[PDB]
Design an enzyme around this catalytic site. Structure first.
Site, PDB file in Angstrom:
ATOM      1  N   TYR A 200     108.717  -1.314 -71.962  1.00  0.00           N
ATOM      2  CA  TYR A 200     109.929  -1.789 -72.646  1.00  0.00           C
ATOM      3  C   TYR A 200     109.770  -3.154 -73.331  1.00  0.00           C
ATOM      4  O   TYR A 200     110.731  -3.640 -73.927  1.00  0.00           O
ATOM      5  CB  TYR A 200     111.095  -1.826 -71.650  1.00  0.00           C
ATOM      6  CG  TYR A 200     111.428  -0.445 -71.157  1.00  0.00           C
ATOM      7  CD1 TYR A 200     112.146   0.452 -71.935  1.00  0.00           C
ATOM      8  CD2 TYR A 200     111.013  -0.020 -69.920  1.00  0.00           C
ATOM      9  CE1 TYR A 200     112.482   1.715 -71.482  1.00  0.00           C
ATOM     10  CE2 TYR A 200     111.308   1.251 -69.466  1.00  0.00           C
ATOM     11  CZ  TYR A 200     112.040   2.129 -70.250  1.00  0.00           C
ATOM     12  OH  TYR A 200     112.341   3.381 -69.806  1.00  0.00           O
TER      13      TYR A 200
ATOM     14  N   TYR B 264     108.792  10.503 -58.934  1.00  0.00           N
ATOM     15  CA  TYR B 264     108.277   9.155 -59.126  1.00  0.00           C
ATOM     16  C   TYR B 264     109.106   8.137 -58.364  1.00  0.00           C
ATOM     17  O   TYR B 264     110.270   8.327 -58.058  1.00  0.00           O
ATOM     18  CB  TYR B 264     108.207   8.783 -60.612  1.00  0.00           C
ATOM     19  CG  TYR B 264     109.554   8.533 -61.229  1.00  0.00           C
ATOM     20  CD1 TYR B 264     110.274   9.586 -61.749  1.00  0.00           C
ATOM     21  CD2 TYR B 264     110.133   7.289 -61.291  1.00  0.00           C
ATOM     22  CE1 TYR B 264     111.512   9.396 -62.339  1.00  0.00           C
ATOM     23  CE2 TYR B 264     111.381   7.086 -61.847  1.00  0.00           C
ATOM     24  CZ  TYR B 264     112.097   8.147 -62.372  1.00  0.00           C
ATOM     25  OH  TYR B 264     113.336   8.003 -62.960  1.00  0.00           O
TER      26      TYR B 264
ATOM     27  N   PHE C 122     104.306   2.422 -61.092  1.00  0.00           N
ATOM     28  CA  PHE C 122     104.829   3.718 -60.688  1.00  0.00           C
ATOM     29  C   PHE C 122     103.864   4.413 -59.746  1.00  0.00           C
ATOM     30  O   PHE C 122     102.659   4.419 -59.965  1.00  0.00           O
ATOM     31  CB  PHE C 122     105.087   4.667 -61.866  1.00  0.00           C
ATOM     32  CG  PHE C 122     106.200   4.258 -62.780  1.00  0.00           C
ATOM     33  CD1 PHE C 122     105.945   3.457 -63.887  1.00  0.00           C
ATOM     34  CD2 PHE C 122     107.500   4.676 -62.552  1.00  0.00           C
ATOM     35  CE1 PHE C 122     106.980   3.077 -64.739  1.00  0.00           C
ATOM     36  CE2 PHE C 122     108.510   4.342 -63.422  1.00  0.00           C
ATOM     37  CZ  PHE C 122     108.257   3.523 -64.501  1.00  0.00           C
TER      38      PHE C 122
ATOM     39  N   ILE D 155     108.601   6.217 -72.052  1.00  0.00           N
ATOM     40  CA  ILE D 155     107.710   5.123 -72.440  1.00  0.00           C
ATOM     41  C   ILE D 155     106.304   5.657 -72.699  1.00  0.00           C
ATOM     42  O   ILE D 155     105.823   6.645 -72.130  1.00  0.00           O
ATOM     43  CB  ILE D 155     107.722   4.001 -71.385  1.00  0.00           C
ATOM     44  CG1 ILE D 155     107.375   4.498 -69.982  1.00  0.00           C
ATOM     45  CG2 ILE D 155     109.058   3.293 -71.434  1.00  0.00           C
ATOM     46  CD1 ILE D 155     107.122   3.401 -69.008  1.00  0.00           C
TER      47      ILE D 155
ATOM     48  N   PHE E  58     113.168  -0.188 -58.639  1.00  0.00           N
ATOM     49  CA  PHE E  58     114.238  -0.070 -59.599  1.00  0.00           C
ATOM     50  C   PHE E  58     114.691   1.374 -59.798  1.00  0.00           C
ATOM     51  O   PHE E  58     115.805   1.584 -60.293  1.00  0.00           O
ATOM     52  CB  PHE E  58     113.890  -0.736 -60.932  1.00  0.00           C
ATOM     53  CG  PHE E  58     112.785  -0.098 -61.722  1.00  0.00           C
ATOM     54  CD1 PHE E  58     113.028   0.906 -62.633  1.00  0.00           C
ATOM     55  CD2 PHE E  58     111.478  -0.516 -61.554  1.00  0.00           C
ATOM     56  CE1 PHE E  58     111.995   1.501 -63.329  1.00  0.00           C
ATOM     57  CE2 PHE E  58     110.443   0.067 -62.265  1.00  0.00           C
ATOM     58  CZ  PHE E  58     110.709   1.080 -63.142  1.00  0.00           C
ATOM     59  N   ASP E  59     113.854   2.369 -59.463  1.00  0.00           N
ATOM     60  CA  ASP E  59     114.278   3.746 -59.610  1.00  0.00           C
ATOM     61  C   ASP E  59     113.392   4.651 -58.775  1.00  0.00           C
ATOM     62  O   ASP E  59     112.253   4.331 -58.523  1.00  0.00           O
ATOM     63  CB  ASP E  59     114.301   4.173 -61.070  1.00  0.00           C
ATOM     64  CG  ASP E  59     115.198   5.386 -61.312  1.00  0.00           C
ATOM     65  OD1 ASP E  59     116.205   5.528 -60.573  1.00  0.00           O
ATOM     66  OD2 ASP E  59     114.959   6.105 -62.263  1.00  0.00           O
TER      67      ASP E  59
HETATM   68  C1  LIG Z   1     115.222   8.441 -65.497  1.00  0.00           C
HETATM   69  C2  LIG Z   1     115.014   7.888 -66.830  1.00  0.00           C
HETATM   70  C3  LIG Z   1     113.645   7.620 -67.469  1.00  0.00           C
HETATM   71  C4  LIG Z   1     113.972   6.627 -68.557  1.00  0.00           C
HETATM   72  N1  LIG Z   1     112.922   6.545 -69.569  1.00  0.00           N
HETATM   73  C5  LIG Z   1     113.314   6.939 -70.985  1.00  0.00           C
HETATM   74  C6  LIG Z   1     114.362   6.111 -71.472  1.00  0.00           C
HETATM   75  C7  LIG Z   1     115.403   6.643 -72.207  1.00  0.00           C
HETATM   76  C8  LIG Z   1     116.383   5.813 -72.674  1.00  0.00           C
HETATM   77  C9  LIG Z   1     116.369   4.450 -72.452  1.00  0.00           C
HETATM   78  C10 LIG Z   1     115.314   3.940 -71.720  1.00  0.00           C
HETATM   79  N2  LIG Z   1     114.310   4.790 -71.253  1.00  0.00           N
HETATM   80  C11 LIG Z   1     111.606   6.298 -69.278  1.00  0.00           C
HETATM   81  O1  LIG Z   1     110.796   6.353 -70.222  1.00  0.00           O
HETATM   82  C12 LIG Z   1     111.050   5.932 -67.983  1.00  0.00           C
HETATM   83  C13 LIG Z   1     109.940   6.844 -67.535  1.00  0.00           C
HETATM   84  C14 LIG Z   1     110.588   8.185 -67.191  1.00  0.00           C
HETATM   85  C15 LIG Z   1     111.575   8.020 -66.011  1.00  0.00           C
HETATM   86  C16 LIG Z   1     112.643   7.041 -66.414  1.00  0.00           C
HETATM   87  N3  LIG Z   1     112.087   5.769 -66.912  1.00  0.00           N
HETATM   88  S1  LIG Z   1     112.002   4.505 -65.831  1.00  0.00           S
HETATM   89  N4  LIG Z   1     111.823   4.916 -64.376  1.00  0.00           N
HETATM   90  O2  LIG Z   1     111.099   3.578 -66.423  1.00  0.00           O
HETATM   91  C17 LIG Z   1     113.652   3.782 -65.893  1.00  0.00           C
HETATM   92  C18 LIG Z   1     114.504   3.913 -64.823  1.00  0.00           C
HETATM   93  C19 LIG Z   1     115.769   3.336 -64.928  1.00  0.00           C
HETATM   94 CL1  LIG Z   1     116.850   3.389 -63.599  1.00  0.00          CL
HETATM   95  C20 LIG Z   1     116.149   2.670 -66.094  1.00  0.00           C
HETATM   96  C21 LIG Z   1     115.280   2.568 -67.178  1.00  0.00           C
HETATM   97 CL2  LIG Z   1     115.686   1.754 -68.620  1.00  0.00          CL
HETATM   98  C22 LIG Z   1     113.991   3.116 -67.071  1.00  0.00           C
END
Ligand SMILES: C=C[C@H]1CN(Cc2ccccn2)C(=O)[C@@H]2CCC[C@H]1N2[S@@](=N)(=O)c1cc(Cl)cc(Cl)c1
Length: 128
Positions: free
Chosen positions: A101, A45, A118, A75, A55-56
Site C-alpha cells: 500500500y 491468511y 503474512f 496487492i 491487522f487481519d
Molecule cells: C480482505 C481484503 C484483502 C484486501 N486487499 C485488496 C484491497 C481492496 C481494496 C482496498 C484495499 N485492498 C488486499 O490486497 C490484501 C491481500 C488480500 C487480503 C486482504 N488484504 S490485506 N490482508 O492486506 C488487508 C486487510 C484489511 Cl483488514 C484491510 C486492508 Cl486495506 C488490507
C-alpha cells in the site's frame, strides 16, 4: 519471531530482484503445479504490521479469502507470492510497501510506508 525470520532468512521472489517480496516455505505443498493467471484461488491468511499488531485474519472469519490470480484484485505481492505456491503449501511473505500500500497506506488499518508480514495457506485453485 516469524517476521524477523523471513526478513533475515527469506528468498527474493520478485522479477526485479529488489528484495521487495521475501518468502519462506513453511509447509511443502502437493506436486509441482502452481496456479495460473485467472484461477480462482482460495487462501487462508494472517497479516501483521511491523508494530506487532495482527491487522487481519481469514481464519478468524471462518471462511477463506477468494480472488482471481494476477488480475490486480489484491496487492502486487499477493499476485506474485500466491503464484509461487503449490496446493496445500503454507508460506510466509515479507512485503515492502512498494509491493503493498505504499506511501498511501489504506485507512484505517494500514499505515503509510508499511512493511507487511503474512502467513498464507493455499487451499485450492481452479478455473481459468
Ligand atoms: C480482505 C481484503 C484483502 C484486501 N486487499 C485488496 C484491497 C481492496 C481494496 C482496498 C484495499 N485492498 C488486499 O490486497 C490484501 C491481500 C488480500 C487480503 C486482504 N488484504 S490485506 N490482508 O492486506 C488487508 C486487510 C484489511 Cl483488514 C484491510 C486492508 Cl486495506 C488490507
Amino acid at each position: 519471531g516469524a517476521p524477523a525470520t523471513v526478513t533475515e532468512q527469506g528468498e527474493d521472489i520478485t522479477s526485479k530482484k529488489d528484495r521487495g517480496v521475501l518468502k519462506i516455505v513453511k509447509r511443502v505443498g502437493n506436486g509441482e503445479e502452481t496456479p495460473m493467471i485467472g484461477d480462482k484461488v482460495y487462501v487462508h491468511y494472517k497479516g501483521k504490521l511491523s508494530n506487532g499488531k495482527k491487522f487481519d485474519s481469514s481464519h478468524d472469519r471462518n471462511e477463506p479469502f477468494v480472488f482471481s490470480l494476477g488480475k490486480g484484485q489484491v496487492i502486487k505481492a499477493w499476485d506474485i507470492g500466491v503464484a509461487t505456491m503449490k496446493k496445500g503449501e503454507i508460506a510466509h511473505l515479507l512485503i515492502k510497501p512498494e509491493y503493498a500500500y505504499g506511501s498511501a497506506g489504506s485507512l484505517p488499518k494500514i499505515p503509510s510506508n508499511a512493511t507487511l508480514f503474512f502467513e498464507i495457506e493455499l487451499l485450492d485453485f481452479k478455473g481459468e
